[PDB]
Design a protein around this nucleic acid. Sequence first.
DNA 1: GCGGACTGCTTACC
Length: 898
Amino acid sequence: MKEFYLTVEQIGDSIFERYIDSNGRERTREVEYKPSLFAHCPESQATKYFDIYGKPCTRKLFANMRDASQWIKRMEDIGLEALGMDDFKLAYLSDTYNYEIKYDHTKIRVANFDIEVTSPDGFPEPSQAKHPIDAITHYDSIDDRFYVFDLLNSPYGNVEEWSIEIAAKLQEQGGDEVPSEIIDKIIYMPFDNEKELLMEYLNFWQQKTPVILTGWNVESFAIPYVYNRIKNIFGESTAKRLSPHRKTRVKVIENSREIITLFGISVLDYIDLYKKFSFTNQPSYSLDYISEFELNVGKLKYDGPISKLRESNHQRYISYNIIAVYRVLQIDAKRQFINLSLDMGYYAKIQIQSVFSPIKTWDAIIFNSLKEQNKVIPQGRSHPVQPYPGAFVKEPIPNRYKYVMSFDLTSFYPSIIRQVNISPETIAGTFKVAPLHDYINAVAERPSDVYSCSPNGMMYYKDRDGVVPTEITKVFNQRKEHKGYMLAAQRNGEIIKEALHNPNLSVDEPLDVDYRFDFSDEIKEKIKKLSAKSLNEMLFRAQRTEVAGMTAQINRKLLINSLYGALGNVWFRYYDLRNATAITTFGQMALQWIERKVNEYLNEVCGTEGEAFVLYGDTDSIYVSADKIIDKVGESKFRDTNHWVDFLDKFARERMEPAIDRGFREMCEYMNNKQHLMFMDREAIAGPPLGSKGIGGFWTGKKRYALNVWDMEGTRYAEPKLKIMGLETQKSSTPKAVQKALKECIRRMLQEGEESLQEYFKEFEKEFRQLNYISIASVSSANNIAKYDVGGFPGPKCPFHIRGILTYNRAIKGNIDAPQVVEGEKVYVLPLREGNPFGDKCIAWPSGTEITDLIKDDVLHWMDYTVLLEKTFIKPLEGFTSAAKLDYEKKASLFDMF
DNA sequence: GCGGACTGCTTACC
Ligand SMILES: Cc1cn([C@H]2C[C@H](O)[C@@H](COP(=O)(O)OP(=O)(O)OP(=O)(O)O)O2)c(=O)[nH]c1=O
Ligand SMILES: [Ca+2]
Ligand SMILES: [Ca+2]
Ligand SMILES: [Ca+2]
Ligand SMILES: [Ca+2]
Ligand code: NA
Ligand code: NA
Ligand code: NA
Ligand code: NA
Ligand code: NA
Ligand code: NA
């Protein structure tokens, strides 16, 4: 096989690389890398090298990397540009791997681990590490084994060995329900004392040194705790064995919090992977909560606090430590963020951990692309941060909207980049701008008949290829492929859902199909004959495939959109507000241009005149009212709900889309762009069920609407799905039960109507006081707690949730056992009635947890249900109904005298 | 006494 790197580091004049060789063996080498940088030279001394603007450069080879650095500093002192890749690691990877890297993940050692630390006095600070490590579970992807390190003897209690027999048993059997599929993959190692455990763990670590290191909060807890605990017990030199090059870096962030860097290892903390790539916003980030959300597994049941879990039930303590490791593996098998990281990493030729940084990622991609053409990249420059305009958002009339059909541009900003040919080296010049609306209304003169233009005043060469359009097109093409797999899996999913209404009472097996492709006619008919067991199992697999495709597509979308963003970031080598603004301004034009076009077409083709068909739009979308399209054919002429959905689908596809294409082709001609790429397709088709009292949809304002959608991008739902954006149902700050309740209110408004809504509202108001307190607690981030802490009491302008935390701190004052609220973390928040013993109107505690038993029963007693109802439920519901022209409570009439 | 304007904060949409 072809060679591929694992990790790379720069240590002085040395580059330490771990890699897989031709034969597939993991090796390590120290290369005294000789880097090259470039300086502008006279036109005479022209060679192979030119900068992106075509200026000739002399290559300077350095004896070592330190000489290259000092030369950059000297060029600064003189005042001349020092060109080339300054991050020498990237240059090394580029030199050593001058080809598209095809890697084998089975050769990459991916380590998942989690530790346990019993602490009698609050959270065990990793910087201190004054408490014994009493459990480590370490999964090795190559061995496919769970290595368990268990401490039997500790100053916090002596315990017996862990039983794998009991761990495997059901919880109903008094066991721990450790999943059977990993029982045989467990390698158990008990220890007499901590020193021998840690000594053995280090030797294990040397034999099986992680390349990718992951787990849950491993960077902020596990890694620094293990490092410091070993450093304290054995000395710093022994602690440095955690690095395969024996080099570590301790980053001090008192704010005492330390972030350790282990050279030769790529740490991909899964909580960080999750926060960046999952596109969720969770009210809690405990592994327990996340596992429940992602995998639908039950909460880990146990008695007493974790601080005493080891002494009381050491059996369950160890089993839970093993399960915690497996949970992350399971989440990754679904989400596949590690696979995504490896893909991006080797594509860009960076350190794998640099996937968290789109700027670093694109810097390397662009550098490699330019390097292949013997071109030289510019030097990074210092820039002041400046604001600049972005997208346009139409102000909608707050109202209900019965029939709605939406359209959206494909990969807007990247497409604009490719269309206009926007790139640092393709700038042709400028022109005098007319106001933006003159271009929208096709009144302003054509900017240029020679160059490609944006309404911000920028002109670009139509002939030359740009490194930014070139490299962004490559990633986009990948994105398009993976979205295709996703949508097909989604379409296949609905097919199975429909067949779940007629499940055959039979014993069979789930069909063997690649869910990434639309089911063949053969497969469809077989599905209509399978059992509920086989169908449900297929549905599960169809959704797993869809999720996998989602991860692959939405994050390539994130990457390319981040390239656009990078153009407006001062730390990006190719920062340029001319280009950034060229994109956004063009976008503002493009959206409002097509609004005018669609309005003109519809008005004509619908017979009317001057009517507003487009009711809303954000950045690159339009929401077209389709009432008069349905009315032009008459509502009675439709068989069922599905019939008119088929009609609008055909109408949007056969008539609207070609018209929209013509409008954008003209705009492309107007701007004299390089290539027409403004592709606006139909997205949603919304409306009430046929012959019902539902309103279909409504808008309360910008970025706040709800639609009863029957079809989305070609996927025809078996049951109508509510597309709700911006409303309280979509916010993590809204209490769980309230989200659920508000959504059903919305569902009833859109699908059933006013009477159904009032019916449900009356019931919810009557019974909501029985809801669990967690389900009705609000959630908020806890930032700058100390900023508003004045003697344990709320200082001036203290935020409501911060007040709740201060209330909590006073309530738990005097107990180190009580859970502390962590700065930056999220908290549950509850209002308190006026005569409460806490001395304030609200209280807040760490989210994802049951509030401490110290004050729990008192909180439950003094909860303000009246305030909770009106503030979190009624007030938002009033907003929904006012806009939609509805009442949630039956109004008083003159008939009330009867 | 409290509403409206403005501010900080939070978390959406794109
Ligand atoms: C979601 C998102 C969008 N945007 C900008 C750039 C996008 O082109 C524009 C519209 O975003 P979207 O319309 O939401 O998505 P997209 O057009 O980029 O690609 P697609 O619709 O086919 O899934 O908004 C960002 O800059 N950052 C983001 O995170
Ligand atoms: Ca011993
Ligand atoms: Ca779009
Ligand atoms: Ca689309
Ligand atoms: Ca089309
Ligand atoms: Na743990
Ligand atoms: Na069970
Ligand atoms: Na120490
Ligand atoms: Na059937
Ligand atoms: Na007419
Ligand atoms: Na979309």
